[PDB]
Amino acid sequence: KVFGRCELAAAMKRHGLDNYRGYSLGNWVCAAKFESNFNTQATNRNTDGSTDYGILQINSRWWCNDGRTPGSRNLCNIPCSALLSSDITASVNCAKKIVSDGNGMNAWVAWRNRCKGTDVQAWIRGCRL
Ligand SMILES: [Cl-]
Ligand SMILES: [Cl-]
Ligand code: NA
Q1: Active-site residues: which are they?
Q2: Can you list the disulfide-bonded cysteine pairs?
């Protein structure tokens, strides 16, 4: 599923991400836009052989099991394929654990380099929330 901007904003809010660990909803939307372009089926392989899955490109190195990432963990206790669903519940639940890990949203590369510090409220401008 490719979400629209305000649609994902609403789904993220309904799933409790708005202001989770202090991060306003426009930071989550902005991170999704640059990680997956709002596509829940996005997958991208990393050089170390791990893969990132879903709207928030959660990495099999630590967070989900895909069966082909040696030495990794599955701290969200989920198959990485659950992260590609049209229903974002598993991605959101697993992102809450990631954002609580000690480094905040800096866990997402693209958020640190493309969202952090910018006018992220623009990502939810005009949306019915
Ligand atoms: Cl594995
Ligand atoms: Cl923080
Ligand atoms: Na894993």
Answers
A1: 35, 52
A2: 6-127, 30-115, 64-80, 76-94
Determination method here? Answer: X-ray
Q: How many CB atoms lie within 10 A of CB 73?
A: 12
CA of 19 to the centre of ligand 1 (A): 32
What would the two tokens of residue 35 be? 């990680």
* Interval between CA 53 and ligand 1 midpoint (Å): 14
**Is residue 87 marked as binding?**
no
Considering the four listed CATH numbers 1.10.8.60, 2.102.10.10, 1.10.530.10, 2.60.120.10, the one that applies to the domain covering 1-129 is 1.10.530.10
89 token code pair: 């519940």
Give the angle 77-35-21 at the CA atoms, nearest 5°.
60
